[PDB]
Design an enzyme around this catalytic site. Structure first.
Site, PDB file in Angstrom:
ATOM      1  N   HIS A  66      -1.313   1.562  -4.418  1.00 54.75           N
ATOM      2  CA  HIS A  66      -1.119   2.507  -3.326  1.00 54.75           C
ATOM      3  C   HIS A  66      -0.187   3.648  -3.715  1.00 54.75           C
ATOM      4  O   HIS A  66       0.633   3.527  -4.640  1.00 54.75           O
ATOM      5  CB  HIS A  66      -0.531   1.803  -2.090  1.00 54.75           C
ATOM      6  CG  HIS A  66       0.899   1.407  -2.279  1.00 54.75           C
ATOM      7  ND1 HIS A  66       1.270   0.323  -3.046  1.00 54.75           N
ATOM      8  CD2 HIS A  66       2.055   1.979  -1.856  1.00 54.75           C
ATOM      9  CE1 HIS A  66       2.587   0.231  -3.071  1.00 54.75           C
ATOM     10  NE2 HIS A  66       3.092   1.221  -2.348  1.00 54.75           N
ATOM     11  N   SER A  76      13.944  -1.376   0.184  1.00 53.37           N
ATOM     12  CA  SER A  76      13.293  -0.097  -0.080  1.00 53.37           C
ATOM     13  C   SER A  76      13.086   0.795   1.152  1.00 53.37           C
ATOM     14  O   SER A  76      13.071   0.337   2.304  1.00 53.37           O
ATOM     15  CB  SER A  76      11.941  -0.335  -0.756  1.00 53.37           C
ATOM     16  OG  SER A  76      10.955  -0.624   0.211  1.00 53.37           O
ATOM     17  N   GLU A  91       2.685   6.124  -1.436  1.00 54.46           N
ATOM     18  CA  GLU A  91       3.442   5.939  -0.199  1.00 54.46           C
ATOM     19  C   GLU A  91       2.774   6.639   0.996  1.00 54.46           C
ATOM     20  O   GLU A  91       1.925   7.526   0.818  1.00 54.46           O
ATOM     21  CB  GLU A  91       4.867   6.455  -0.384  1.00 54.46           C
ATOM     22  CG  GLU A  91       5.579   5.809  -1.557  1.00 54.46           C
ATOM     23  CD  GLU A  91       5.699   4.300  -1.374  1.00 54.46           C
ATOM     24  OE1 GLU A  91       6.229   3.877  -0.333  1.00 54.46           O
ATOM     25  OE2 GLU A  91       5.266   3.551  -2.266  1.00 54.46           O
ATOM     26  N   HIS A 104       0.994   3.035  -7.558  1.00 50.01           N
ATOM     27  CA  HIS A 104       1.638   1.907  -8.194  1.00 50.01           C
ATOM     28  C   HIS A 104       1.143   0.601  -7.580  1.00 50.01           C
ATOM     29  O   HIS A 104       0.612   0.577  -6.446  1.00 50.01           O
ATOM     30  CB  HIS A 104       3.179   2.031  -8.107  1.00 50.01           C
ATOM     31  CG  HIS A 104       3.699   2.339  -6.732  1.00 50.01           C
ATOM     32  ND1 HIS A 104       3.628   3.595  -6.168  1.00 50.01           N
ATOM     33  CD2 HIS A 104       4.296   1.547  -5.807  1.00 50.01           C
ATOM     34  CE1 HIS A 104       4.158   3.565  -4.957  1.00 50.01           C
ATOM     35  NE2 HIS A 104       4.565   2.333  -4.711  1.00 50.01           N
ATOM     36  N   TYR A 113      12.391  -7.050   1.070  1.00 43.22           N
ATOM     37  CA  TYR A 113      11.238  -7.848   0.638  1.00 43.22           C
ATOM     38  C   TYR A 113      11.715  -9.074  -0.111  1.00 43.22           C
ATOM     39  O   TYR A 113      12.309  -8.946  -1.193  1.00 43.22           O
ATOM     40  CB  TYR A 113      10.287  -7.055  -0.291  1.00 43.22           C
ATOM     41  CG  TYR A 113       9.602  -5.849   0.318  1.00 43.22           C
ATOM     42  CD1 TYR A 113      10.260  -4.626   0.422  1.00 43.22           C
ATOM     43  CD2 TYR A 113       8.284  -5.921   0.751  1.00 43.22           C
ATOM     44  CE1 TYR A 113       9.631  -3.510   0.976  1.00 43.22           C
ATOM     45  CE2 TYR A 113       7.649  -4.814   1.301  1.00 43.22           C
ATOM     46  CZ  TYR A 113       8.332  -3.614   1.411  1.00 43.22           C
ATOM     47  OH  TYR A 113       7.706  -2.523   1.959  1.00 43.22           O
ATOM     48  N   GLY A 116      10.621   1.146   7.696  1.00 46.78           N
ATOM     49  CA  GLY A 116      10.320   1.107   6.281  1.00 46.78           C
ATOM     50  C   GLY A 116      10.122   2.482   5.656  1.00 46.78           C
ATOM     51  O   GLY A 116      10.067   2.599   4.445  1.00 46.78           O
TER      52      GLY A 116
HETATM   53  C1  LIG Z   1      -0.975  -4.721   3.128  1.00 42.43           C
HETATM   54  O1  LIG Z   1      -0.015  -4.504   2.124  1.00 42.43           O
HETATM   55  C2  LIG Z   1       1.250  -4.173   2.646  1.00 42.43           C
HETATM   56  C3  LIG Z   1       1.952  -3.306   1.590  1.00 42.43           C
HETATM   57  O2  LIG Z   1       1.670  -3.419   0.380  1.00 42.43           O
HETATM   58  N1  LIG Z   1       2.916  -2.424   2.103  1.00 42.43           N
HETATM   59  C4  LIG Z   1       3.688  -1.528   1.290  1.00 42.43           C
HETATM   60  C5  LIG Z   1       3.689  -0.154   1.638  1.00 42.43           C
HETATM   61  C6  LIG Z   1       4.328   0.772   0.834  1.00 42.43           C
HETATM   62  C7  LIG Z   1       4.992   0.325  -0.331  1.00 42.43           C
HETATM   63  O3  LIG Z   1       5.661   1.282  -1.046  1.00 42.43           O
HETATM   64  C8  LIG Z   1       5.036  -1.029  -0.649  1.00 42.43           C
HETATM   65  C9  LIG Z   1       5.605  -1.482  -1.870  1.00 42.43           C
HETATM   66  C10 LIG Z   1       5.899  -2.812  -2.059  1.00 42.43           C
HETATM   67  C11 LIG Z   1       6.525  -3.146  -3.232  1.00 42.43           C
HETATM   68  C12 LIG Z   1       7.142  -4.450  -3.279  1.00 42.43           C
HETATM   69  O4  LIG Z   1       6.530  -5.407  -2.573  1.00 42.43           O
HETATM   70  O5  LIG Z   1       8.169  -4.724  -3.874  1.00 42.43           O
HETATM   71  C13 LIG Z   1       6.729  -2.250  -4.271  1.00 42.43           C
HETATM   72  C14 LIG Z   1       6.289  -0.925  -4.033  1.00 42.43           C
HETATM   73  N2  LIG Z   1       5.771  -0.543  -2.866  1.00 42.43           N
HETATM   74  C15 LIG Z   1       4.375  -1.972   0.159  1.00 42.43           C
HETATM   75 MN   LIG Z   2       5.190   1.552  -2.845  1.00 37.03          MN
END
Ligand SMILES: COCC(=O)Nc1ccc(O)c(-c2cc(C(=O)O)ccn2)c1
Ligand SMILES: [Mn+2]
Ligand SMILES: [Zn+2]
EC number: 1.14.11.66
Length: 351
Positions: free
Chosen positions: A185, A285, A187, A273, A174, A167
């Site tokens: 969060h 992604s 990155e 974001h 997703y 990832g």
């Molecule tokens: C415990 O939660 C897991 C998580 O949110 N992982 C994660 C880690 C880094 C990321 O960039 C994204 C993420 C997820 C999305 C999405 O689900 O589309 C959009 C933007 N960022 C998701």
């Molecule tokens: Mn993200």
């Protein structure tokens, strides 16, 4: 110069021609010359000419090995999201659940209505997010904006050490359904990310400008003192949801944007974001870097309470791209301060 570009730090949207679109790193450098990074988030709409896959009618058998049920707890615009791992299922099985009466999208007029309904019903009827599926839906020949092989300097990690980080320097798929969410969060290692919505209902996003990221962290530490004392970066757990009305209430600047099928989202170093899916959809992604990220990487504050967490050795990046600073950095005396407004040096092309 940079201070005067996108002084509102609002989310910008770009419509490159196919000629502009063919070189990924170059276009990222371009949007930064336009101050896009100041928002922490930008939308890029590819030429209508462009497609990464001719058909998605052939993926119903694709396995989601670790679907996640999202149980959300809280009230008053502040929530904690717990993940419940469910048994593997296929895209067709997921779609069936997603489109069922129990889980499907509610009817509504304007987006503001759906948004209100998300923040009212977030803790009820926990949905399933088919998140972190290893893979790509790009055809092997697609050479533009291929999330599988973007060719940025993040490639230096695998190159130097052979390490793959799923990832992060490999793609994730997703599969979303209504009311599935991603918590506030930045990155891993405060890298960039790219998000492509292959198909389906939209994905709405919230963003806090990097130059105001610390204010969000301060707010979060105040609402969750226990978490803040247990971990030096508890938002990296990606469990914390905070409503735009709470952000407004405490003067955190933020913007909103809705991403539709066929559209890219780019997040920038230290851009907080969060968001949610409108309904059944599918996003791909990964992370990437620019020369600008290196200082963010050096200064990233990582999760201190888990061993499972992502950590990239900065050594090779500092030797290769900041050789004059390496000794100072290694001796702990590199006190460089980050200017979130400056574009990456590769942007000098466009000034
Ligand atoms: C415990 O939660 C897991 C998580 O949110 N992982 C994660 C880690 C880094 C990321 O960039 C994204 C993420 C997820 C999305 C999405 O689900 O589309 C959009 C933007 N960022 C998701
Ligand atoms: Mn993200
Ligand atoms: Zn932690």
């Amino acid at each position: 110069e940079s201070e005067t570009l996108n002084p509102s730090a609002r989310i910008m949207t770009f419509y490159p021609t196919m000629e502009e679109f063919r070189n990924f790193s170059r276009y990222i450098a371009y949007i930064e010359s336009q101050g896009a990074h100041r928002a922490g988030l930008a939308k890029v709409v590819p030429p209508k000419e462009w497609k990464p896959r001719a058909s998605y009618d052939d993926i119903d058998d694709l396995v989601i090995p670790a679907p996640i049920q999202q149980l959300v707890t809280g009230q008053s615009g502040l929530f904690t999201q717990y993940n419940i791992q469910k048994k593997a299922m296929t895209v067709r099985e997921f779609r069936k659940i997603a489109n069922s009466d129990k889980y499907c999208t509610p009817r509504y007029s304007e987006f503001e209505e759906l948004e209100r309904k998300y923040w009212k019903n977030l803790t009820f009827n926990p949905p399933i997010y088919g998140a972190d599926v290893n893979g790509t839906l790009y055809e092997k020949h697609v050479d533009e904006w291929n999330i599988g092989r973007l060719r940025t300097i993040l490639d230096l990690v695998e190159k130097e050490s052979g390490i793959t980080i799923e990832g992060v320097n490999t793609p994730y798929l997703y599969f979303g359904m209504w009311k599935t969410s991603f918590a506030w969060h930045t990155e891993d290692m405060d890298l960039y990310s790219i998000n492509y919505l292959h198909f389906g209902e939209p994905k709405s996003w919230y963003s806090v400008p990097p130059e105001h990221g610390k204010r969000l962290e301060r707010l979060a530490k105040g609402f969750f003192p226990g978490s803040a004392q247990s971990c030096e970066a508890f938002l990296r757990h990606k469990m914390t949801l905070i409503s735009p009305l709470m952000l407004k209430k405490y003067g955190i600047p933020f913007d909103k944007v809705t991403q539709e099928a066929g559209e890219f989202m780019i997040t920038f170093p230290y851009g907080y974001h969060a968001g949610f899916n409108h309904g059944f959809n599918c996003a791909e992604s990964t992370n990437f870097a620019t020369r600008r990220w290196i200082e963010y990487g050096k200064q990233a504050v990582l999760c201190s309470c888990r061993k499972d967490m992502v950590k990239i050795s900065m050594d090779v990046f500092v030797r290769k791209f900041q050789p004059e600073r390496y000794k100072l950095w290694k001796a702990g005396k590199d006190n460089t301060v980050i200017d979130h407004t400056l574009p990456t040096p590769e942007a000098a092309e466009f000034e």
